Design an enzyme around this catalytic site. Structure first.
Site, PDB file in Angstrom:
ATOM      1  N   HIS A 182      24.801  26.595  19.470  1.00 31.58           N
ATOM      2  CA  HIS A 182      24.953  25.148  19.333  1.00 31.58           C
ATOM      3  C   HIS A 182      24.907  24.702  17.870  1.00 31.58           C
ATOM      4  O   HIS A 182      25.677  23.823  17.466  1.00 31.58           O
ATOM      5  CB  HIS A 182      23.879  24.424  20.145  1.00 31.58           C
ATOM      6  CG  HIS A 182      23.966  22.929  20.048  1.00 31.58           C
ATOM      7  ND1 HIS A 182      25.042  22.211  20.528  1.00 31.58           N
ATOM      8  CD2 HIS A 182      23.120  22.021  19.508  1.00 31.58           C
ATOM      9  CE1 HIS A 182      24.851  20.924  20.294  1.00 31.58           C
ATOM     10  NE2 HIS A 182      23.692  20.782  19.675  1.00 31.58           N
ATOM     11  N   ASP A 216      27.526  27.235  24.779  1.00 33.75           N
ATOM     12  CA  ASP A 216      26.495  26.307  24.335  1.00 33.75           C
ATOM     13  C   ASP A 216      25.425  26.149  25.409  1.00 33.75           C
ATOM     14  O   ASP A 216      25.728  25.826  26.562  1.00 33.75           O
ATOM     15  CB  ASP A 216      27.105  24.949  24.002  1.00 33.75           C
ATOM     16  CG  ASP A 216      26.206  24.118  23.119  1.00 33.75           C
ATOM     17  OD1 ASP A 216      24.991  24.050  23.414  1.00 33.75           O
ATOM     18  OD2 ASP A 216      26.706  23.538  22.132  1.00 33.75           O
ATOM     19  N   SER A 220      26.223  17.894  16.214  1.00 32.37           N
ATOM     20  CA  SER A 220      25.460  17.600  17.423  1.00 32.37           C
ATOM     21  C   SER A 220      25.326  16.082  17.536  1.00 32.37           C
ATOM     22  O   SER A 220      26.358  15.390  17.576  1.00 32.37           O
ATOM     23  CB  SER A 220      24.161  18.402  17.349  1.00 32.37           C
ATOM     24  OG  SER A 220      23.427  18.329  18.564  1.00 32.37           O
TER      25      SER A 220
END
Ligand SMILES: [Ca+2]
Ligand SMILES: [Ca+2]
Ligand SMILES: [Ca+2]
Ligand SMILES: [Ca+2]
Length: 242
Positions: A216, A186, A89
């Site tokens: 995610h 996502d 991320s």
């Protein structure tokens, strides 16, 4: 509350970077998988993380990048020249930027966003991060609402928005081998970011993989063993000196 980890095996090393309001336990299973393959791995934690959420508000994303650079320098101090950086991320954004500041053998971005759009998904999540934490703290339901109406995230979430835009304009300078990993469904970032990365780096050696059933936080979802194996495939294809 989680803490960094260091698994020493062979001479090929991987630096693991977690996401915003995440911690090392988000990448721990991946660390255990790499160790069993004989890769050394190291996972630092950003300032304010694995801590009460108020600590994040007193911090800055620009500190968090230095915590990543200190991670790389730590591996080199410990005896490891040859390092891949892998980031989850937000950490995937840091991995891209880190490759412009240190010599890496390769990059792995996992669900890394492109664009400082912090509204909607990023906002509620910082809020929920404090809800479940204030719950973890053993605070009654009347209390959780009190320090919540005193939670001002506009400051921190706005430095995050600038930082991301800066890195987006920098993707065209990345040169090292890269593997782009993205979850199809996502809800947190725009999954099209993975196409932006794969298409705009200047790498001579690149690869993109899509996962159709994960969320995610892909390193802990149902398809994670598949994701670990594809990372291993990538690592073995680089030009390690040993
Ligand atoms: Ca040592
Ligand atoms: Ca540029
Ligand atoms: Ca080119
Ligand atoms: Ca390749």
């Amino acid at each position: 509350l989680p803490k960094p980890f260091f698994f020493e095996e062979g001479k090929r090393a991987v630096l693991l970077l977690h996401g915003f309001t995440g911690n090392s336990s988000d990448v721990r299973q991946l660390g255990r998988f790499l160790q069993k393959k004989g890769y050394t791995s190291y996972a630092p934690q950003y300032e304010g993380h694995a801590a009460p959420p108020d600590e994040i508000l007193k911090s800055s994303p620009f500190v968090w990048f230095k915590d990543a650079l200190d991670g790389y320098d730590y591996l080199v101090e410990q005896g490891y020249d040859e390092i891949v950086v892998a980031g989850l991320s937000l950490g995937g954004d840091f991995a891209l930027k880190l490759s412009l500041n240190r010599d890496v053998k390769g990059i792995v971005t996992m669900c890394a966003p492109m664009g400082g759009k912090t509204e909607g998904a990023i906002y509620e999540g910082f809020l929920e991060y404090a809800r479940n934490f204030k719950k973890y703290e053993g605070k009654d339901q009347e209390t959780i609402d009190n320090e919540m109406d005193h939670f001002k995230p506009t400051e921190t979430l706005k430095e995050l928005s600038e930082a991301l835009d800066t890195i987006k304009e920098q993707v065209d300078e990345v040169l090292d081998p890269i593997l782009v990993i993205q979850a199809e469904n996502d809800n947190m970032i725009d999954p099209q970011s993975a196409n932006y990365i794969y298409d705009h780096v200047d790498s001579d050696d690149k690869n993109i993989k899509w996962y159709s059933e994960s969320g995610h936080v892909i390193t802990i979802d149902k398809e994670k063993e598949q994701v670990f194996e594809d990372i291993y495939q990538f690592l073995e294809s680089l030009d390690w000196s040993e």
